[PDB]
Amino acid sequence: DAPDEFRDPLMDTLMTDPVRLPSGTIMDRSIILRHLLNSPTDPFNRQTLTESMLEPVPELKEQIQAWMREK
């Protein structure tokens, strides 16, 4: 299994492409972008959210790729 900080909020899925929202939530880029196709909102607190507000988390993305190298 994988540590919680490498997984999407509430989910079992590994974030291969983590992004931070302005609120502080970190989640996979592929989830939040598909949510934004339907609604211009942060899905958790309902604030306005657009794609340009998302930030990469390079150190976490690298740490996750490093963890994937344990097979």
Residue numbers in the entry: 1098 to 1168
Text from the published report:
We report the development of three ubiquitin variants (UbVs), each binding selectively to the RING or U-box domain of a distinct E3 ligase: monomeric UBE4B, phosphorylated active CBL, or dimeric XIAP. With ∼600 members, the RING/U-box E3s form the largest family. This family uses a RING or U-box domain to recruit E2 enzymes thioesterified with Ub (E2∼Ub) and facilitates transfer of Ub directly to substrate. RING/U-box domains promote Ub transfer by shifting the equilibrium of E2∼Ub into a closed conformation (Dou et al., 2012b, Plechanovová et al., 2012, Pruneda et al., 2012). We generated selective UbVs for each RING/U-box domain and used biochemical assays and structural studies to identify two types of UbVs: competitive inhibitors of E2∼Ub binding sites on UBE4B or phosphorylated CBL and an activator of XIAP.
UBE4B is known as a Ub elongation factor or E4 because it binds preformed Ub conjugates and catalyzes formation of polyubiquitin chains (Kaneko et al., 2003, Koegl et al., 1999). UbV.E4B selectively inhibited E4B, the U-box domain of UBE4B. We attempted to co-crystallize UbV.E4B with several E4B U-box variants of differing lengths. A crystal structure of UBE4B U-box comprising residue 1,097 to the C terminus (E4B1097–C) was determined to a resolution of 1.48 Å, but no crystals of a complex with UbV.E4B were obtained. To investigate whether UbV.E4B and E2 compete for the same binding site on E4B, we monitored CSPs in 15N-UbcH5B competition experiments. Addition of equimolar E4B to 15N-UbcH5B strongly affected several residue peaks within the spectra indicating formation of 15N-UbcH5B-E4B complex. Subsequent titration of UbV.E4B caused 15N-UbcH5B signals to shift back to free E2 positions, showing that UbV.E4B inhibits E4B by occupying the E2-binding site.
